[PDB]
Every structure is written in C-alpha cells, then in structure tokens.
Amino acid sequence: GSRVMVIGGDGYCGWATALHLSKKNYEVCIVDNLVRRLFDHQLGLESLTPIASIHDRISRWKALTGKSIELYVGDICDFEFLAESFKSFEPDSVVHFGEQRSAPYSMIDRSRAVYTQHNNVIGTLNVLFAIKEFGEECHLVKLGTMGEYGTPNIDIEEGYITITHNGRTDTLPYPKQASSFYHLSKVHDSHNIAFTCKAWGIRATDLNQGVVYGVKTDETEMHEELRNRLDYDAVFGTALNRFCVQAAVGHPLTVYGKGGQTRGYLDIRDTVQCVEIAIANPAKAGEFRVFNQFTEQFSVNELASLVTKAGSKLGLDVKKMTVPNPRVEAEEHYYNAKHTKLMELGLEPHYLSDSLLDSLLNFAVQFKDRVDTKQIMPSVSWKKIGVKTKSM
Amino acid sequence: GSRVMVIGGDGYCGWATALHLSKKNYEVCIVDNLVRRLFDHQLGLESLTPIASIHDRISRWKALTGKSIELYVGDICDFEFLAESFKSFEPDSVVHFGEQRSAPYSMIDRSRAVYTQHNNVIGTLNVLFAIKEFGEECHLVKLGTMGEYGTPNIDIEEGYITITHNGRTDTLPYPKQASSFYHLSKVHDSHNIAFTCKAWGIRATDLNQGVVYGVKTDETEMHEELRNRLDYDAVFGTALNRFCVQAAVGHPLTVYGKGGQTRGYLDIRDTVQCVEIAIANPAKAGEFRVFNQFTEQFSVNELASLVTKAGSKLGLDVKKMTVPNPRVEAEEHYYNAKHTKLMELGLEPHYLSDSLLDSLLNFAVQFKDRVDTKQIMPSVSWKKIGVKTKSM
Ligand SMILES: NC(=O)c1ccc[n+]([C@@H]2O[C@H](COP(=O)([O-])OP(=O)(O)OC[C@H]3O[C@@H](n4cnc5c(N)ncnc54)[C@H](O)[C@@H]3O)[C@@H](O)[C@H]2O)c1
Ligand SMILES: NC(=O)c1ccc[n+]([C@@H]2O[C@H](COP(=O)([O-])OP(=O)(O)OC[C@H]3O[C@@H](n4cnc5c(N)ncnc54)[C@H](O)[C@@H]3O)[C@@H](O)[C@H]2O)c1
Numbered sequence: 016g017s018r019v020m021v022i023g024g025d026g027y028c029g030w031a032t033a034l035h036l037s038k039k040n041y042e043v044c045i046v047d048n049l050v051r052r053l054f055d056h057q058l059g060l061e062s063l064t065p066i067a068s069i070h071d072r073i074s075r076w077k078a079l080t081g082k083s084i085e086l087y088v089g090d091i092c093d094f095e096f097l098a099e100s101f102k103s104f105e106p107d108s109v110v111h112f113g114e115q116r117s118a119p120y121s122m123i124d125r126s127r128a129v130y131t132q133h134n135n136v137i138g139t140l141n142v143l144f145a146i147k148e149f150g151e152e153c154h155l156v157k158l159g160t161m162g163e164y165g166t167p168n169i170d171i172e173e174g175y176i177t178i179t180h181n182g183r184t185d186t187l188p189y190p191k192q193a194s195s196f197y198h199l200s201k202v203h204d205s206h207n208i209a210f211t212c213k214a215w216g217i218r219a220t221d222l223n224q225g226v227v228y229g230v231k232t233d234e235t236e237m238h239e240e241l242r243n244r245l246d247y248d249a250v251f252g253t254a255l256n257r258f259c260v261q262a263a264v265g266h267p268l269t270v271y272g273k274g275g276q277t278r279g280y281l282d283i284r285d286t287v288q289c290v291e292i293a294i295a296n297p298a299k300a301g302e303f304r305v306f307n308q309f310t311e312q313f314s315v316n317e318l319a320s321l322v323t324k325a326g327s328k329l330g331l332d333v334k335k336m337t338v339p340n341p342r343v344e345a346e347e348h349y350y351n352a353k354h355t356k357l358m359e360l361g362l363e364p365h366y367l368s369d370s371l372l373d374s375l376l377n378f379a380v381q382f383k384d385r386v387d388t389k390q391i392m393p394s395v396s397w398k399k400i401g402v403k404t405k406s407m
Numbered sequence: 408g409s410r411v412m413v414i415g416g417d418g419y420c421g422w423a424t425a426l427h428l429s430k431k432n433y434e435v436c437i438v439d440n441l442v443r444r445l446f447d448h449q450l451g452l453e454s455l456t457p458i459a460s461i462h463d464r465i466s467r468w469k470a471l472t473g474k475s476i477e478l479y480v481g482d483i484c485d486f487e488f489l490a491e492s493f494k495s496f497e498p499d500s501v502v503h504f505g506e507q508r509s510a511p512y513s514m515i516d517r518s519r520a521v522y523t524q525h526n527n528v529i530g531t532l533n534v535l536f537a538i539k540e541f542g543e544e545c546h547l548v549k550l551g552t553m554g555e556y557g558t559p560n561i562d563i564e565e566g567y568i569t570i571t572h573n574g575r576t577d578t579l580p581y582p583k584q585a586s587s588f589y590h591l592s593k594v595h596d597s598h599n600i601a602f603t604c605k606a607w608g609i610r611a612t613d614l615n616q617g618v619v620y621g622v623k624t625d626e627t628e629m630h631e632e633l634r635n636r637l638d639y640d641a642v643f644g645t646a647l648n649r650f651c652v653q654a655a656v657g658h659p660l661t662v663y664g665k666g667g668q669t670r671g672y673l674d675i676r677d678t679v680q681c682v683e684i685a686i687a688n689p690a691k692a693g694e695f696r697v698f699n700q701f702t703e704q705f706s707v708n709e710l711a712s713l714v715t716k717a718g719s720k721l722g723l724d725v726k727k728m729t730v731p732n733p734r735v736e737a738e739e740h741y742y743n744a745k746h747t748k749l750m751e752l753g754l755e756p757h758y759l760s761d762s763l764l765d766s767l768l769n770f771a772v773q774f775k776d777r778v779d780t781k782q783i784m785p786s787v788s789w790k791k792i793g794v795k796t797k798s799m
C-alpha cells in the first residue's frame with residue numbers, strides 16, 4: 016505494498032510515522048519543504064537532540080533496512096509541485112502533517128498569524144484538489160487538533176453531537192472554539208474537508224490529536240542518524256516534554272497561570288500506531304470520520320507533580336514556578352473528552368508510566384549541555400501581538 | 408459625525424450602504440480594489456443596469472448633496488495599504504463587504520476556490536489587526552452569511568445555541584455546515600473574529616444576511632450615475648433578481664432541481680437599514696454579536712410562483728423549467744431560522760410585495776435589450792470542478 020504519502024515527514028510526528036509505516040511494509044514517500052528547520056534558524060531555536068539532514072536520515076534507513084523512502088522537497092501551497100509529486104508517487108493514502116503547528120508561533124505578529132492561516136488552509140485545499148483530480152479513491156488522514164473544541168461546559172465528543180432542540184433531533188458537527196490562530200486554521204481545515212467529503216465523495220479521517228510526549232520510537236532508536244527532534248523552547252516545545260527538560264537542567268517547572276488547564280496527551284509511540292490503524296481501516300467514500308486521538312487527560316499541575324516525583328528518583332530536586340500566563344485560556348475548567356473510536360479499532364496504548372518519565376528525564380540529563388536556557392521562558396503574548404514583524 | 412469605513416463600497420450592497428450612511432450624516436469612506444469589475448470583464452458578464460465608475464459615482468453624490476465620500480483604492484490583503492487607509496481616515500466603525508461573495512465563482516476551478524479563501528480569510532484577518540493596532544474601540548460590522556448554518560433538521564438560531572448534553576448545559580457557537588468554498592470562507596471569518604473578540608476585546612457584529620433582492624434605494628435613484636448594479640448571470644446573479652430578469656426577457660424560470668431549497672431573503676432597502684442599526688447600536692468591548700439578517704423565508708418554487716403571478720399582470724406569460732442542479736445541496740429540507748434581534752432594535756421591514764415585484768419586473772423590461780441570454784443558464788458544476796484554470 017500500500018502506498019502512503021507522508022506530507023510533513025521531516026517533522027516530529029511525521030518522521031516517526033514515516034519510518035514506522037515503512038517498517039510495516041507500506042511504500043512511503045515524504046513531501047516536505049523543510050521550512051520548520053528554517054524557523055529554528057530564524058528564531059534562534061534548536062532541538063535538544065541533534066538531528067541529521069532529511070537526506071542523511073533517509074539514506075541511513077536504506078543502509079540499515081534496504082527500504083527506500085522517496086523524497087519530494089517543495090511547498091504544498093505550490094500546486095504544480097504537489098500535483099507532480101502526486102502523479103509521480105500515486106498514493107493510496109495521504110497523511111497530512113505538513114502545517115505550521117505552533118500556537119505561540121501563530122501569535123508572534125500579524126505576518127506569522129497570516130502565514131499560519133494561509134499556509135495551513137491553502138495547503139490543505141491543494142491536497143483535497145490533488146486527491147480529487149489525480150486519485151479520487153485516495154484516503155486522506157489529516158492531523159486536526161483536540162484544540163478545535165476548546166473547553167466547553169459539556170462533554171466533548173468525537174467530532175459530532177446529537178442534539179434535541181425545540182422538539183427536533185439532529186446529529187451535527189461539534190461546535191468549535193479555538194484559542195489561537197494556529198488552532199483556528201485547523202478548524203478551517205476540518206470544515207473544508209467535511210464539505211469535500213459530501214460534495215466530491217472524498218474519504219477522510221480527521222485525527223484530533225492531543226499533546227504528544229516522548230522522543231523514542233522503535234525505528235528512530237535504531238541508529239543515531241534516525242533520531243527524532245525534541246523541542247523544549249517556549250515556541251515549539253509542548254508541556255510535558257518542556258517540563259522534563261526543565262527538570263533536567265534545574266529550571267523550575269513553568270506552570271502558566273493557575274495550572275488547571277486540562278488536555279489530552281499521548282506518547283509518540285501511540286501517534287504512529289494510531290496513524291497506521293487509520294490507514295489500515297480506511298474511511299468509506301464520502302465519509303468524514305473524526306477520531307479524538309489521545310490516551311489520557313492531565314492538568315498542567317498534574318504533569319508538574321508527576322515530573323517532580325520522577326525527578327526525585329533521579330536526584331534532581333524539581334521546583335515549580337507560576338508564570339503569568341502569556342495565553343488567553345481557561346485556567347480552571349470542566350474537561351471530559353470522549354476517546355473510544357481508535358480503541359474500538361485495536362489501539363493498544365502506552366499509558367504514561369514511571370518507566371517513560373525515567374527514560375525521558377535521563378535522556379534530557381544526557382543532553383543537558385545542549386540546552387539553551389534563554390529559550391525556556393515564554394515571550395509571546397496573545398494580547399500584546401502587534402503588526403511589526405518581530406526579530407527574536 | 409461618526410466615521411464609517413465601508414470596505415467593498417463599490418459593490419452591490421456596499422454602494423447602497425455607503426450612500427445611505429452618508430445621507431444619514433456619518434462621515435464615510437470607501438475602500439475597494441474594484442476587482443469585482445475585473446471579474447465581469449474576465450468572465451464576459453455585465454450588469455443589467457449600466458453603472459458609472461466609482462469616481463463618477465462619488466463626484467455625482469458630491470454635486471447633488473455637497474457631501475464627500477473619501478476613496479481608497481487598494482487590496483485589503485496588502486496590509487501597508489489597509490493600515491495607511493485606516494490611519495488616514497480614523498474610522499469609528501468598519502463595515503466589511505469586501506469579499507469574493509459568489510458561491511459559483513468559488514467553484515469554478517482550484518485557482519478560484521483558493522483565491523476565494525485566501526482573499527476572504529486573509530483580508531478579514533488584516534482588518535482585525537488594523538482595528539487592534541490603530542483603533543481598538545472601532546466596531547467591526549461584518550457581513551457573514553445565512554449559508555454558514557446549512558440546512559439542519561433543527562431550528563437555526565442567531566449564532567448561538569444553548570445545549571444540555573449528558574446532564575450539563577452550555578451556550579455554544581451554532582454548528583456550521585457550509586456548502587461552497589465561498590460559504591466556507593465566511594465560516595472561517597466568523598470563527599476568527601469570535602476569537603479576537605475574546606482575546607483582544609474587539610467589538611464585532613456578524614450580520615448573517617439572507618439573499619438580497621432589488622435594485623432601488625432612495626439614494627441610488629437620485630441620479631442615473633448613482634445607479635446600483637443588478638446581476639442576472641448564473642455566476643453572480645441570485646435567485647429572485649435572476650427570475651425577474653428571466654421573466655422580462657421571456658426565458659423560463661430556472662428552478663434548480665426540485666426547487667424546495669428554502670432561504671431567508673430581504674430587500675436591499677433593508678440591507679442598508681440593518682447595517683445602520685448595527686452601527687448606531689454597537690457591540691460592547693469583547694462582544695461578538697450575531698444577527699440573522701433577513702425578513703422572510705421562501706423556497707425557490709415559491710419565488711417562481713410569485714414572479715409568475717406578478718408577470719401575468721404585465722402580460723409576460725412566465726414559464727418555468729427544471730434545471731439539473733449544478734450544486735450539491737438539499738432540494739427538500741426543514742428550515743426555520745430565527746430572526747428577532749434586528750427587529751428588537753427597531754427594524755421596519757419592507758416585506759416582499761406586489762408593488763416591489765411590479766417595479767422590479769418593469770425595470771428589467773426597460774433594460775431587456777441589454778440582457779445577454781447566453782449567461783442565464785448555469786455552467787459551473789460543484790462536482791466536476793477541476794484544477795485547470797478555466798476561460799469562460
Ligand atoms: N507536536 C505535537 O504535540 C502535536 C500534537 C497534536 C497534533 N500535532 C499535529 O501534527 C502535525 C505535525 O506536528 P509536528 O509536531 O510533527 O510538527 P513539525 O513542525 O515538527 O512538522 C511539520 C512539518 O511540516 C512541514 N511543512 C509545513 N508547512 C509545509 C508546506 N507548506 N509544505 C511542505 N511541508 C510543510 C515542516 O517543514 C515540518 O517538517 C501538525 O498538524 C500538528 O498540529 C502535533
Ligand atoms: N448579494 C447578496 O445577495 C448578498 C446576500 C447576503 C450577503 N451578502 C454579502 O455582502 C457582501 C457584499 O456582497 P455584494 O453582493 O455587495 O458583492 P459585490 O461583489 O457586489 O461587492 C464586493 C466588493 O468588494 C470588493 N472587494 C473584494 N475583495 C476585495 C479586496 N481584497 N480588497 C478590497 N475590496 C475588495 C469588490 O471589488 C466589490 O466592489 C459579501 O460579504 C456578501 O457575501 C451579499
């Protein structure tokens with residue numbers, strides 16, 4: 016074999032997924048413009064883990080396993096490039112990870128908010144048109160986000176909700192309430208994809224994924240050149256990974272505001288398993304499936320406590336600090352999100368464990384010398400965003 | 408005064424609104440790149456009514472009344488131009504009509520679908536950033552669309568719905584189900600604006616307007632150079648206006664599919680009244696108001712019957728025809744949309760009448776010689792849309 020095009024395959028979730036699918040005997044290609052690497056240079060950021068070039072990564076996988084992952088380097092907003100890549104590779108499934116995914120990045124200034132929405136929304140439209148024109152039976156596996164739902168006072172469902180209003184009943188798309196220009200772009204993508212499923216018969220699965228944690232997967236650990244990236248800065252780093260690096264270097268854990276912000280989380284090992292399950296059990300023609308892709312819910316305060324306890328077993332004397340919240344969001348809220356569809360399809364989750372935290376903390380300790388502590392604290396305000404292009 | 412910037416003020420709703428606000432003693436400017444006129448040239452379309460240039464329109468208003476409407480000609484996706492215009496004029500309210508508004512146009516080909524979403528979504532983001540940066544208390548009056556809601560099996564509310572789910576209650580944004588790339592772009596705009604109201608304290612009113620009919624308003628009838636446009640082609644023309652022109656030239660009324668498609672409608676005289684009411688009674692800081700802006704619901708079959716009856720009084724022997732539907736939409740559906748907010752603020756509606764139809768039909772008869780009958784039938788298919796840029 017089945018052929019899979021992994022858009023955004025040089026990135027954190029995409030690289031792990033591309034190797035996993037190749038190991039599982041799918042024919043794989045990666046489509047990526049490598050702009051994520053340019054943003055690191057522009058903002059003065061760097062991965063905790065040293066990573067190899069995409070060309071060296073692919074060459075190493077071939078040297079170890081004999082399998083060749085094809086590479087197409089270009090911007091999916093350039094339709095000529097996307098169309099040529101689709102016609103060259105002929106995918107049966109497309110996994111779309113190729114978007115600007117950082118909420119803080121989308122809030123840096125007007126230019127970055129506009130870039131986020133243009134890049135994300137137009138790139139996704141181009142993918143839909145390429146599938147329609149060149150391979151209409153191709154299944155689109157799209158990375159959405161649990162952030163599309165916001166934090167309502169009712170249970171969050173997997174994409175749809177059956178409502179009885181004024182004596183009539185209907186099943187409708189779940190109301191969306193995004194809290195950054197990045198999260199909004201995903202809501203726009205999901206609405207666009209749903210329309211094309213109905214109008215054109217597209218088959219698609221929206222994976223509304225929770226926050227991912229971890230750096231190791233079976234394939235990326237096979238050789239140092241296959242190593243994945245691990246972000247810890249305040250722009251691309253996410254909560255748990257950030258807390259583990261902070262603990263390792265002796266920085267107090269950065270709890271934003273009250274710390275009651277609750278979200279779904281999952282191990283990167285489960286990201287790759289879930290994508291494979293969605294590919295192996297495809298949506299039907301005209302169907303827009305929505306899966307809430309996470310394994311456990313945690314508040315920021317709960318994460319801080321877990322990291323503190325794991326850190327104590329390693330002699331790190333972890334401390335916590337309250338950072339005035341750079342974001343506009345609820346710091347105490349109801350949260351009960353449903354997640355059963357992937358489990359019904361066979362997901363065997365790796366729940367957060369003492370073993371995982373010990374391994375991740377030891378990993379951060381091993382590379383603590385590479386950590387730029389100046390990038391730990393957040394400097395991007397949701398309220399103070401302006402129009403001048405900022406230089407960090 | 409009070410200062411109002413009318414983005415899209417050379418267009419059908421915008422020109423009528425700009426003159427009305429100027430007559431009502433607001434200081435007005437028009438911001439428009441005139442691209443709508445370019446699309447007419449590119450597609451081979453023309454207004455039923457001959458219209459003057461925007462410069463001659465403004466000069467005539469000044470010659471008649473002594474009032475000067477300021478003009479800024481540029482693309483609001485060019486932030487330097489938008490920012491300079493905002494700083495020059497200093498608006499207290501911004502009315503945003505400046506978007507690609509045709510559903511068929513958005514479905515012509517990939518390039519037009521992408522242009523629609525980029526132009527509309529990025530232009531609106533630029534307006535939000537200009538308000539935040541240069542005049543944070545400025546009230547945004549945005550034209551959304553009744554099409555954002557689609558045709559659910561439950562009553563349609565004015566933007567929000569209170570739901571009880573699994574024993575908890577909350578008031579949430581109403582689920583959106585758009586049916587063209589144009590309608591989707593409005594859903595994206597509404598979600599973006601709602602976020603900025605919460606994050607930045609923006610004051611905004613989304614006017615989800617129904618289909619507009621008519622060509623005359625008090626101000627545009629004061630001199631021939633002030634005349635508004637009246638579209639009848641299958642790309643920019645809308646149902647009632649199209650049926651009146653068809654009746655006048657002897658073309659059978661073009662009912663798409665079964666004809667049970669039901670929508671809200673309103674007279675252009677009410678469009679201008681509603682915008683003025685929203686400006687005179689502004690949203691509060693941080694509030695995202697949503698008004699369903701229409702006065703009556705009609706199915707396409709009902710419109711066809713009304714035009715046939717009015718046409719009989721003028722000796723036109725109106726016929727009807729069933730056209731295989733170019734669109735993907737429900738042709739028989741429940742429809743009960745709420746519309747009380749504008750009435751509570753004082754709206755005095757001009758309900759569809761025998762008098763209005765007689766006047767509109769007589770108007771079409773007066774200019775029947777200008778009608779290009781080759782543009783009456785639809786040639787844009789929702790299902791057959793492709794990637795090659797089409798020449799019409
Ligand atoms: N990291 C997480 O915690 C997390 C959690 C939930 C969902 N996801 C989702 O998974 C996806 C991937 O996230 P990630 O953390 O791997 O991001 P990443 O930034 O590491 O990877 C994205 C990749 O896409 C590429 N890309 C971006 N725009 C492109 C374009 N126009 N053309 C071609 N390539 C382009 C980038 O160069 C990069 O290699 C995103 O949709 C993200 O929202 C990630
Ligand atoms: N016509 C209707 O029946 C109807 C019904 C409901 C809602 N509306 C809404 O009202 C608004 C105006 O509709 P209309 O019928 O007057 O359209 P129109 O096409 O006659 O007017 C739009 C105007 O906006 C200008 N414009 C477009 N993109 C621009 C840009 N990037 N920069 C500057 N100017 C730009 C165009 O040149 C044009 O003069 C739209 O939001 C539309 O969806 C119209």
Ligand SMILES: O=c1ccn([C@@H]2O[C@H](COP(=O)(O)OP(=O)(O)O[C@H]3O[C@H](CO)[C@@H](O)[C@H](O)[C@H]3O)[C@@H](O)[C@H]2O)c(=O)[nH]1
Nearest residue numbers: 116117118160161162224225226253254269270271276315
């Ligand atoms: O040091 C930190 C970092 C984050 N937070 C809070 O933790 C929550 C999660 O934030 P973060 O881990 O930064 O994730 P998101 O910004 O939600 O984004 C990530 O997780 C989303 C899951 O929906 C994906 O959509 C995005 O692409 C991905 O970047 C938020 O309430 C933050 O304010 C803290 O309190 N302290």
Ligand SMILES: O=c1ccn([C@@H]2O[C@H](COP(=O)(O)OP(=O)(O)O[C@H]3O[C@H](CO)[C@@H](O)[C@H](O)[C@H]3O)[C@@H](O)[C@H]2O)c(=O)[nH]1
Nearest residue numbers: 508509510552553554616617618645646661662663668707
């Ligand atoms: O000759 C015709 C034209 C239209 N229709 C049907 O009538 C309905 C209304 O279509 P139309 O009048 O073309 O309006 P919309 O495409 O809905 O768009 C207009 O009205 C919307 C109101 O929401 C605005 O958002 C848009 O900007 C504006 O172009 C639809 O079901 C059409 O398929 C026919 O049956 N015959």
